[PDB]
Amino acid sequence: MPTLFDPIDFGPIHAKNRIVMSPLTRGRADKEAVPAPIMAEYYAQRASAGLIITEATGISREGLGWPFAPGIWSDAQVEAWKPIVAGVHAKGGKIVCQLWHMGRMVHSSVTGTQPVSSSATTAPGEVHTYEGKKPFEQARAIDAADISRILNDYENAARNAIRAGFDGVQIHAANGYLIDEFLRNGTNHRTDEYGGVPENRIRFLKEVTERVIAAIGADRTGVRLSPNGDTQGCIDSAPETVFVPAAKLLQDLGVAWLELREPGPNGTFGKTDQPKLSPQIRKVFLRPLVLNQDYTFEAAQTALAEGKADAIAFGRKFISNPDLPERFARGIALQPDDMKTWYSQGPEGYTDYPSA
Numbered sequence: 018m019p020t021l022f023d024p025i026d027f028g029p030i031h032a033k034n035r036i037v038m039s040p041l042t043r044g045r046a047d048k049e050a051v052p053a054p055i056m057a058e059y060y061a062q063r064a065s066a067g068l069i070i071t072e073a074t075g076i077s078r079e080g081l082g083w084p085f086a087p088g089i090w091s092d093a094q095v096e097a098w099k100p101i102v103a104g105v106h107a108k109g110g111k112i113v114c115q116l117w118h119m120g121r122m123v124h125s126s127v128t129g130t131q132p133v134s135s136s137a138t139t140a141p142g143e144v145h146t147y148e149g150k151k152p153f154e155q156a157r158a159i160d161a162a163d164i165s166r167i168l169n170d171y172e173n174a175a176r177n178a179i180r181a182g183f184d185g186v187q188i189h190a191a192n193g194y195l196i197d198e199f200l201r202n203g204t205n206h207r208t209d210e211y212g213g214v215p216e217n218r219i220r221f222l223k224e225v226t227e228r229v230i231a232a233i234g235a236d237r238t239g240v241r242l243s244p245n246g247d248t249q250g251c252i253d254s255a256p257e258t259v260f261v262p263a264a265k266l267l268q269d270l271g272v273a274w275l276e277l278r279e280p281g282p283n284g285t286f287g288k289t290d291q292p293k294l295s296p297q298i299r300k301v302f303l304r305p306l307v308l309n310q311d312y313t314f315e316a317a318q319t320a321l322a323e324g325k326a327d328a329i330a331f332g333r334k335f336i337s338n339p340d341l342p343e344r345f346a347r348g349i350a351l352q353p354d355d356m357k358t359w360y361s362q363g364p365e366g367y368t369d370y371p372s373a
């Protein structure tokens with residue numbers, strides 16, 4: 018019954034439509050992870066999205082490896098995010114901060130410390146640094162003092178997001194970052210209460226989510242999961258046995274909304290033959306369910322008509338179509354995105370894609 022053009026409530030967040038801007042790392046902050054003024058223009062250009070999910074935003078230096086990505090642990094960062102968020106609100110938009118701990122996906126040259134993870138494992142390929150790509154480093158398996166600290170960092174980051182004026186947060190529990198490295202049995206080789214059976218592998222997600230909810234409210238908390246397909250060396254051998262229970266826990270804790278990134282067999286941002294778990298998750302998580310990856314306008318419209326999702330998040334289309342909702346409403350061709358400038362430092366390929 019819903020179309021992409023119909024409004025939706027994400028908890029108390031009143032979105033004007035169901036065309037979500039997915040989280041996109043762009044690397045237009047400074048080397049100190051403080052947002053830069055150009056980011057205000059980039060997000061204001063995209064304020065017609067029913068909801069913007071920010072680029073992944075580091076909760077701590079330990080968890081933030083991506084060159085020129087922002088953080089939200091410090092008041093300098095909070096003060097720089099304030100005008101960015103204000104410019105979206107002034108255009109009638111809504112925006113949530115995606116809270117990031119990268120886990121084993123960082124390089125020590127950026128963070129100053131060894132990568133941390135569920136287990137002492139190594140991501141495949143090479144990692145981005147300020148001196149170019151380097152081999153990934155084997156992580157260290159976090160202990161109870163580290164868990165306490167990391168929970169504190171999620172708590173503080175969530176508080177700071179609200180302090181900056183964000184409408185809410187999304188916990189980044191996807192794409193082979195720290196939480197995902199606990200969830201999936203390909204990365205989690207722990208012997209303690211955080212390893213082994215699915216309820217143990219969900220425990221870290223549970224504790225992060227509980228601490229964010231206690232800080233800012235369940236109704237202001239969303240989560241992203243990526244249940245299916247290897248992403249950055251992280252895969253589960255039987256994802257339904259951990260991700261359907263994870264989604265149910267989130268439902269029971271009061272989490273306001275859930276986004277699933279789901280590659281398919283012919284996916285163009287990763288691909289996989291692991292089946293998509295959205296149909297099973299839709300039956301256990303009953304609040305707004307946002308799906309993502311490879312959606313066209315007609316596939317998205319059909320998903321909402323068939324009750325498969327309440328909203329769809331678009332990533333690459335929002336890179337090059339700041340006015341994606343208007344282009345869809347008006348049948349205007351979608352401008353191609355320039356992959357060479359996804360992660361570069363310029364305004365080129367960032368704030369210089371025109372609106373219709």
Ligand SMILES: Cc1cc2nc3c(=O)[nH]c(=O)nc-3n(C[C@H](O)[C@H](O)[C@H](O)COP(=O)(O)O)c2cc1C
Pocket residue numbers: 039040041042043071072073115189191192241278286309310311312330331332333334359360
């Ligand atoms: C340049 C770029 C940066 C991205 N950064 C993030 C990110 O910060 N957080 C995240 O959860 N996903 C990130 N993603 C994944 C997207 O949110 C999205 O899942 C992906 O682009 C597929 O959806 P699409 O087919 O609509 O583009 C990124 C994708 C791209 C292309």
